[PDB]
Design a protein around this nucleic acid. Structure first.
Ligand SMILES: [Mn+2]
Ligand SMILES: [Mn+2]
Ligand SMILES: [Mn+2]
Ligand SMILES: [Mn+2]
Ligand SMILES: [Mn+2]
Ligand SMILES: [Mn+2]
Ligand SMILES: [Mn+2]
Ligand SMILES: [Mn+2]
Ligand SMILES: [Mn+2]
Ligand SMILES: [Mn+2]
Ligand SMILES: [Mn+2]
Ligand SMILES: [Mn+2]
Ligand SMILES: [Mn+2]
Lengths: 105, 98, 83, 94, 97, 78, 103, 99
DNA sequence: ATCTCCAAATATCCCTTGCGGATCGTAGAAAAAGTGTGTCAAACTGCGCTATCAAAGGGAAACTTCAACTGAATTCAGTTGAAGTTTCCCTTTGATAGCGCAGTTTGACACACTTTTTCTACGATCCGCAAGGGATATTTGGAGAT
DNA sequence: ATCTCCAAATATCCCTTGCGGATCGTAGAAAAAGTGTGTCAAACTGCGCTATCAAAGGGAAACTTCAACTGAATTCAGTTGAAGTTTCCCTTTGATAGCGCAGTTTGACACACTTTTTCTACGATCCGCAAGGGATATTTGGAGAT
């Protein structure tokens, strides 16, 4: 098996990640396993978001993922919501939500 | 002739705008504002249109979140009506100044 | 031609709309001017930094990236415009 | 000129997870921002850890403790195990 | 002789806002730190400054939180801080969902 | 242990904060809030300790942990 | 020393060394540590100026952590710059909300 | 000897010097010095940190006094920024004079 | 309790487009392979400092007594912001043409880096003496009562 | 508004200890020199940004009417704060026990570097078509009215 991703059993690109670590002045030297570990983490996190956005697309009778689906995904998920607590997804809008006191009585 | 009670259309406006994701501030007016402010910092600036559109996305998101906090401040004080003092309370606790 | 008073293009109807998205049911008539005040400060801060990024690059065109970088600095990372 | 992007990998991982589902261009731009962003946070923290400990080199160890510092509990558990598992497999070859 | 309810509390504010001494007793705080560390990792020691660091950080944090809490109280035309005040402060801070 | 953070002590902190009147329920809340604050910072501090292959939590470890939570502390090795 | 050539108290060599060891970039230009040393000096000058006065105002000849806290929080810009920093043993600015005071 | 008791390194002397420059008859407690040392380190990192990014952002290999200047403009509020830029520019003007 | 009606939701048609799946021809980057070299894991060592111990008093925390004053509940009316209508401003949309300037290219080189010898700034360590601490007294600034 | 009464502010004096200056020794900065490549100035260019015009109509502004919200006013049960008494444990002081942090030396090896071989991923372009998204019509759920 030629490519380092293929070796590591990954879709995400180990060689690109190695290069981006070297050319980003994080340290003088980058160990062999670091971009393997890092490509794996990145692949994993994108699988989690795609999964959860994927479902959001289906609940809204939709076949193609748009930013609203990512936003619904992220903010309906306690952990992704925390991880992207200081982030704004362009064209995501907000969660449907109305405080109780404002409901008609 | 027919009339909805006060608050009914307001609630339905909330549902409508909570479902959608389109920018709520008019596009050219917002662009003029950005250019006016830029100009006061440096003259002869040009803007990529996506640069303006980014600012709008940022601004609408900030303002929308600030109204959520403002509302919580209004409700904290047994009101249903947002008031300047609600925004000011929100911004103070957020650590925003000026 | 001179740019003046453009904060007024941020209309009452448009502020009402943002407040709805934010779940606000009733709005005091004093909210519109407070909001303008606040939006202006918000945009001064971000634009000041974006323009600095532009100047550093010796450019005359503010890019999406200058804004994306300015926002990241203010702890307000934006997704959808590069970076 | 060439504009690098994670688009192809995100498509792949998307086919794995939801095989009959597409992604809009803007949605991808967001995914791309997300991957670059998390990358930055992790490499960043990893950089510090090496400095704090007088080290010249970033290893999968710094990535690992960087991951534990940055990700909320469960997301950190799985990422850590996906990470370790890939390095384990990676050393197993050559 | 009786000072009215509030007169001493006012005096106390003046006293504590004028000093910079720590206000939690040292040992009880130290015990709490080790208990909590114990739940993350067993068989651990602490530099004495490390504990100190945590106390400084912790009190500054709480004092500032009390400032914010007090404002929410006053926002509700009240003078007495209640859990709902802390909860609101912490939420607007973005410390809580 | 958590009750070592006593009612009079909490009052004292509340006073530095400008607080004149305290509901009786505040003391239990503060303890809860303080637990979560210490948990988070110590969680991070200990991660640094472990990474350094030490058994001793340093001031630096704490300072770094405090910097990560966006709570930079001066006076201990910044 | 480069500091003397630049009329600075702060070490231009050390700042230079520290910029090479911090992995900020592949190379460091010659002017950069001067400029940085300068800015660092100006800012510490600035604090000490205001801290000193707070020591004076408190009838003291030695600056303590509390004077640094007073200097910083009574100064709008320094307060902004250290918005997310806590000065150990600094306490708070004496501040009591109006409505809490008796009529 | 032979076993040397490490070696810490701080700004304490240069701070002490600047303290003399502006408050000749005023001193500083060791704890307060620790605070100033932190402050210098903190600012240093925030500045060099931006400058590093500016260099990356612009596909450049060197941190120049140009990145320090704009890093300072991004980091420091109104009046501090303006003064810091004067002091910095001036030192470079002066340092390049001296040969 | 029952009917009226309005606007959001459902349905039909037509059609534009932006997406996934191609196939393509191809710069640029990853991998492969050889080699030079410094980082850091290991193993052994010293001793700084963390834990701990034992005891004894002094002050803090806890508990108790009391009632002042604060939050919570209720009531009501003037104020005010929501809903709906009308007029028409100015945003949006779409195509146009001109050019300011962002981004790519190419040689000459200044300027950073690397290595080695020389010189010295600044860390470690030391302790006299005064700024500050701590104790007791006298002045002052205000609260609570009459 | 005036007269008794605490507690904090101020004054005074004697002890305590960390400021801050001084001594001494080295690691790190400066000086001098040879090498090369990132940076810079200058030439050329076409993307896309500003600028305009012009027609269409969606949305803003200004208005009237009035439902209902805010907040003013009033009451009071009870939760707090202030002061007293009681019970408990934090802090301080003198070490001795030895963990594990941090210093020192080293050589195997892992990663940097650079060159040649291999192929991944990007930019350009066309296609089937389900997915939308807009223009036009209808049915539907429920708010408000009789
Ligand atoms: Mn202007
Ligand atoms: Mn002076
Ligand atoms: Mn098409
Ligand atoms: Mn396509
Ligand atoms: Mn009650
Ligand atoms: Mn004295
Ligand atoms: Mn004293
Ligand atoms: Mn007198
Ligand atoms: Mn008086
Ligand atoms: Mn000293
Ligand atoms: Mn209309
Ligand atoms: Mn041992
Ligand atoms: Mn019906």
């Amino acid at each position: 098996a030629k490519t380092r991703s293929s070796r590591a059993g990954l879709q995400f690109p180990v060689g690109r990640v190695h290069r981006l670590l070297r050319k980003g002045n994080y340290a003088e030297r980058v160990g062999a396993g670091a971009p393997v570990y890092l490509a794996a983490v990145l692949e994993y996190l994108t699988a989690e978001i795609l999964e959860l956005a994927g479902n959001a697309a289906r609940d809204n009778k939709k076949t193609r993922i748009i930013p609203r689906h990512l936003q619904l995904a992220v903010r309906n998920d306690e952990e992704l919501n925390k991880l992207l607590g200081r982030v704004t997804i362009a064209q995501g809008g907000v969660l449907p939500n109305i405080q109780s006191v404002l409901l008609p009585k | 002739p027919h009339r909805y009670r006060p608050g009914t259309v307001a609630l339905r406006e909330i549902r409508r705008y909570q479902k959608s994701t389109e920018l709520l501030i008019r596009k050219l007016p917002f662009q003029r504002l950005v250019r006016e402010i830029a100009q006061d910092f440096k003259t002869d600036l040009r803007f990529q249109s996506s640069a303006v559109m980014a600012l709008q996305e940022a601004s609408e998101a900030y303002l929308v979140a600030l109204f959520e906090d403002t509302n919580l401040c209004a409700i904290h004080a047994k009101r249903v009506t947002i008031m300047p003092k609600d925004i000011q309370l929100a911004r103070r606790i957020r650590g925003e100044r000026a | 031609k001179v740019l003046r008073d453009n904060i007024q293009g941020i209309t009452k109807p448009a502020i009402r709309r943002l407040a709805r998205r934010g779940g606000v049911k009733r709005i005091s008539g004093l909210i519109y001017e407070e909001t303008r005040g606040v939006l202006k400060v918000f945009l001064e801060n971000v634009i000041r930094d974006a323009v600095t990024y532009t100047e550093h690059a010796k450019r005359k065109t503010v890019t999406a990236m200058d804004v994306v970088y300015a926002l990241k600095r203010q702890g307000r990372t934006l997704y959808g415009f590069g970076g | 000129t060439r504009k690098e992007s994670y688009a192809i990998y995100v498509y792949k991982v998307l086919k794995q997870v939801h095989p009959d589902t597409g992604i809009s261009s803007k949605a991808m731009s967001i995914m791309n921002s997300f991957v670059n962003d998390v990358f930055e946070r992790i490499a960043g923290e990893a950089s510090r850890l090496a400095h704090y400990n007088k080290r010249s080199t970033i290893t999968s160890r710094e990535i690992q403790t960087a991951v534990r510092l940055l990700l909320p509990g469960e997301l950190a558990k799985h990422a850590v195990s996906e990470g370790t598992k890939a390095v384990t497999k990676y050393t197993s070859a050559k």
